[PDB]
């Protein structure tokens, strides 16, 4: 039972211990390509690399490398792509990936202060479209809705080679510090639901692309919480979902997901608050009490 597990961990002050176990039990796979000399400038951090088996391969003969991982969650029936904040020289690759994987949405979690650990890869003005000559792509801002702690942008991505166009919804949560946690579980859940509402996470489209700076801490929290909510919703017994086990599964696709014990605790916190109404196997009368 997730909730009782939470209270027991809190009561015994075990968060650090649990997180330590998760790290010790986490999957370890080769990252040969990411460590290739020709890819030194395609990585934002020397200590954050995508496993060779789950890395996203760009469809180009030049150099198919990008620091991005495909996280496929079979039981949840949702896939996500986690990547680092694009670099000045990798903005074209970022969009090529978006195009090639048929993604409809991008989730950004960099904190707007100051300067972001992410290059400016999207247009600031509708009238100033962006052209990535290296990958033959054009990107135009169609509309932008700035709100209190997040901003939603509508973008038109055009493959200049085929003249085909796609609408990309870009969601940027602006009040989440690196290595930290959201202002509150509720604002985080409000953001998660806005993204779900857009249809960007639908099975009909390619995997949603999620990033921040490294693409493991905040990016991992976002995906873990979403997956646990999915599993709890399609399971006869919500309480049977084991977050620790879900995180370890996810870590099979990308290293270091969830960077701190606090982020681990927050994930539990948000999942529990977001699962408050999932009935499960209870009856109308029981769910009333």
């Amino acid at each position: 039972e997730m909730e009782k597990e939470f209270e027991q961990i809190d009561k015994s002050g075990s968060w650090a211990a649990i997180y330590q176990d998760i790290r010790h039990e986490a999957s370890d796979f080769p990252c040969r390509v990411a460590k290739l000399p020709k890819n030194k400038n395609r990585n934002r951090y020397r200590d954050v690399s995508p496993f060779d088996h789950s890395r996203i391969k760009l469809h180009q003969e030049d150099n198919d490398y990008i620091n991005a991982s495909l996280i496929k969650m079979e039981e949840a029936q949702r896939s996500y792509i986690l990547t680092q904040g694009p670099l000045p020289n990798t903005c074209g690759h970022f969009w090529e990936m978006v195009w090639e994987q048929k993604s409809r949405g991008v989730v950004m979690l960099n904190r707007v202060m100051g300067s972001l650990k992410c290059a400016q890869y999207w247009p600031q003005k509708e009238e100033k479209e962006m052209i990535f000559e290296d990958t033959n792509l054009k990107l135009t801002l169609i509309s932008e809705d700035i709100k209190s702690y997040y901003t939603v942008r509508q973008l038109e991505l055009e493959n200049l080679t085929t003249q085909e166009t796609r609408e990309i919804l870009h969601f940027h949560y602006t009040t989440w510090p690196d290595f930290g946690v959201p202002e509150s579980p509720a604002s985080f859940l409000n953001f998660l639901f806005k993204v779900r509402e857009s249809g960007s996470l639908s099975p009909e489209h390619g995997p949603v692309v999620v990033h921040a700076s490294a693409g493991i801490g905040r990016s991992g929290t976002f995906c873990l919480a979403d997956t646990c909510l999915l599993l709890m919703d399609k399971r006869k017994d919500p309480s049977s979902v084991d977050i620790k086990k879900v995180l370890l599964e996810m870590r099979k696709f990308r290293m270091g997901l969830i960077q701190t014990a606090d982020q681990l605790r927050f994930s539990y916190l948000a999942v529990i608050e977001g699962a408050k109404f999932i009935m499960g196997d209870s009856s109308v009368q029981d769910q009333w009490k």
Binding site: S148, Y149, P177, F179, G180, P185, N190, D262, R265
Partner: protein
């Protein structure tokens, strides 16, 4: 006023506890934060028995908070000045005020939040967070004058934040404030010079900071328990100070000793405190601190 909020958008749900001037409630506020349909908030009100000065301070707090933007300072969300009662709406801090939080962590606590007492690392972290909020406040040219565990707040992730400014005074021009007439003062948290001459500076605030560390290490025990205010006043002015709570970590004791130097110009600054603890803090500190921000020049 861009901060004025329609009373119909605020609903008081329950009492949270007594604040500086009145009962603080937990409320639900609809459409006060763009992009968020409903927000859980903390609402401050003033008791009907508040004196003229108290009422002035209550409204004054709301006014000064309008210009504050610091991760370690409770955020103001809005005000309801149309009609009565006046309401000051702020971000809700999941674990309430630090004093109540600390006491609920005592072994005999009946309302235990289901978590153990603070470790040394958690204490250092709280110290740096409070000091960061104070460094910010001082850079904005205000003297707090009433720093105490009860005036600090705890968030869902346990981040501590300065949340009360009922006695805050502007020191832009002179860097200090001298008490004119008489008044009620938090004697157990005051520096000797403030007791003797009613003089308040960032240094006297540093003295209070030391008492707050004492409160943290003793789980909100009452400063100088067993002694009356008259005895406390006499004691501190004569060069006395609080004993180190039993089993108090030495790293913290060293902090209090610095804060309780009789001579105010001998006490460290808040920035010095943070700079002192900077290498033993959570990975996120540099991301949100005033100390590491570009604004700290």
């Amino acid at each position: 006023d861009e901060w004025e909020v329609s009373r119909e958008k605020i609903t008081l749900l329950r009492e949270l506890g007594q604040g500086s001037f009145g009962m603080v409630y937990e409320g639900n506020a609809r459409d006060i934060i763009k992009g968020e349909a409903e927000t859980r908030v903390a609402v401050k009100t003033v008791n009907e028995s508040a004196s003229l000065r108290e009422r002035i301070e209550f409204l004054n707090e709301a006014s000064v908070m309008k210009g504050f933007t610091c991760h370690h300072v409770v955020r103001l969300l809005g005000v309801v000045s149309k009609g009565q009662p006046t309401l000051v709406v702020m971000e809700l801090m999941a674990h309430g005020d630090l004093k109540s939080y600390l006491r609920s962590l005592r072994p005999e606590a009946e309302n235990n939040p289901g978590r153990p007492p603070p470790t040394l690392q958690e204490m250092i972290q709280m110290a740096a967070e409070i000091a960061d909020g104070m460094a910010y406040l001082n850079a904005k040219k205000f003297v707090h004058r009433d720093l105490a565990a009860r005036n600090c707040m705890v968030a869902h992730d346990f981040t501590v934040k300065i949340g009360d400014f009922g006695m805050t005074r502007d020191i832009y021009e002179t860097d200090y404030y001298r008490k004119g007439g008489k008044g009620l003062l938090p004697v157990r948290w005051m520096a000797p010079e403030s007791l003797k001459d009613g003089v308040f500076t960032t240094s006297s605030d540093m003295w209070s900071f030391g008492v707050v560390l004492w409160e943290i290490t003793s789980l909100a025990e009452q400063p100088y328990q067993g002694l009356s205010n008259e005895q406390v006043l006499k004691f501190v002015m004569d060069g006395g100070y609080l004993d180190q709570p039993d089993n108090c970590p030495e790293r913290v004791t060293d902090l209090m000793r610095m804060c309780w130097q009789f001579n105010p110009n001998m006490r460290p600054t808040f920035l010095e405190i943070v700079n002192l603890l900077k290498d033993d803090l959570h990975p996120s500190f540099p991301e949100v601190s005033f100390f590491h921000s570009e604004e700290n020049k």
